[PDB]
Each structure stands twice: as C-alpha cells, then as structure tokens.
C-alpha cells in the first residue's frame, strides 16, 4: 500500500478565533495594466531574454497542475493560465519551464526570485500580500468538505473529533483551525496525499477549495462534496513583491483572456464538473 510521505498528526491546539481584520487590506485589488504594448513588452524584457517563463506549481492538484498519465505532460487549468502569460510574452505559450513547489513553498520561491510567477491555486490574502504581490483574481473558489458517499459528514460541526486532512502551508489549514471542538488535523505535503489517505481510510474527510476537491472526485467518484461555503478562495498569480511591472503585465493577460473567450474555453476544458461556466471574476484595481 502506498503511504504518502510527510503525513503528520498535528498537536491538539485550541480553536483559533475567526479574524475579522482579514479584509482590512482589500486583498483582491491589484495594479492596472499598462496602456501601451511597448510599456508591457519592456516590463518583461528580462523574462524574454531568459528565453522562457519560469512558473512555480506542482503535480499534486488534478485539474489544475498534474501530470497527464497518457501524454506525460504537465497540464491543468493553472498550467494553461500560465501558458497564456507566456503567449503574451513570447507569442506562443510553449516557452515555459516549471519549478516544482509545494503549497508551503509558494511564498518563499517568490521572495527568493526562484520563479517569475506562481500559478498554483494561490488564494490572495492580506497576510500573503505583506510578502508577495498578486494579479487580479483569475478564479474564485470556496472551501468545502470532501467525504465518502456513505459518510454522515455533511456540515462543518461534523468535523469535530474526526480526522481531517489538509496540506501544509494552505489557507485551508487556517480555516480548519477555527473549528470548535477541533478535528484531529492530519497534514500532508499536497492534496493528492489527502486523497491517498482517504482511500486507505487513514482519515475521515478532506477540506479545501471546492475546485481542488472536484479534482479529487474526478479521481475517486466514491467521494462527494458536502457542506456550506466555509471560506472564499480568490486565486491570483503570485509575483515577487517588488516586480510591479510583472503584476501589470499579468493583469493585461487576464483582461485579454476574460474578454477574448480564452477563460471560458479553459473553464469548459477543466472545470465543468462544478457546473456551467460563470462569468470570469471581475478584476478590481487599486489605481
Ligand atoms: N492548496 C491551496 O492552494 C489551497 C488554497 N487555495 C491556498 O491558497 O492555500
């Protein structure tokens, strides 16, 4: 039996209070794109000279960034979003190199300038905005619960005292830490590890973005998604705090794909399990 390396039963801790200052900073507002093509091209000249866009992501999130078992290629919604940025830089999307990063390493790789962008289901938060920059929102998810079809778990309070899996370094862990009385919290490196743990009955439920959970359901249709929206998860492209030019550039790409049909095509390609495509998230700008 496969045992995913890195599984930890976390020490019992008192519930954290829900923090109401979380929206103080208006986290989803970002920087307006450049008005001229020449300004935008200048802002990515260093990337262009390096010959490829270096993108941080992983292979642990089915539907978002994973290795296709048939073609062997890294693919998914997040891969395709990153490829549209590369298309804007290079003219075609294929000039991308990946740096494999866990959820807990997304901020550090940006701080250390180890990638140009992170496209890895990265929720935009005020705490993260103290450390990195973000594009406007490219997909809006919400934290829910995944359990086997025969499980009685249907609401948040059912998680108390039960074994709930979360990946380390995620907003999902922070939300589960609010539950009173606490679940038994089992943490792992990536969300695919939570699926293995549930398949082996080493946990009782998984809680994270409904988008990610839908990817797990696609791999294991014995599971289903239950419960209310537990916490908004607005995804942004993560960028080094000081590279404001790249923020504006990526926001230009997002304006393009929201309006030229590409975003709709990518949603239909990857996410129809969640329902018919909504309108793309409306961008918000500070300036
Ligand atoms: N694994 C994830 O990305 C979960 C959540 N979107 C986060 O930003 O932490």
Numbering used by the authors: 42 to 328
Quoted from the paper:
The conserved aspartate-specific solute-binding protein (SBP) GlnH links extracellular amino acid concentration to PknG activity via the periplasmic transmembrane protein GlnX, thereby controlling glutamate metabolism in Mycobacterium spp. GlnH belongs to the solute-binding protein family, specifically the polar amino acid binding family, which bind to arginine, cysteine, histidine, glutamine, glutamate, and aspartate. The fold of GlnH is related to bacterial solute-binding proteins from ATP transporters and to the sensor domains of glutamate receptors: two lobes close around the Asp ligand in a Venus flytrap-like arrangement. We propose that the amino acid concentration in the periplasm is sensed by GlnH and that protein-protein interaction allows transmission of this information across the membrane via GlnX to activate PknG.
To determine the structural basis of discrimination between higher- and lower-affinity ligands, GlnH was crystallized in the presence of Glu and Asn. Overall, the structures with different ligands bound were similar. The greatest difference is in loops 99 to 103 and 109 to 113 (DIGSN and DPITG, respectively), which are displaced 2 Å in the Glu- or Asn-bound structures compared to the Asp-bound structure. The conformations of the ligand binding site and positioning of the ligands are similar. Asn is unable to form a hydrogen bond with Trp 232, providing an explanation for the difference in affinity of binding. Addition of aspartate, glutamate, or asparagine increased the thermal stability of GlnH, suggesting that these are ligands for GlnH. Our structures of liganded GlnH represent “closed” conformations.
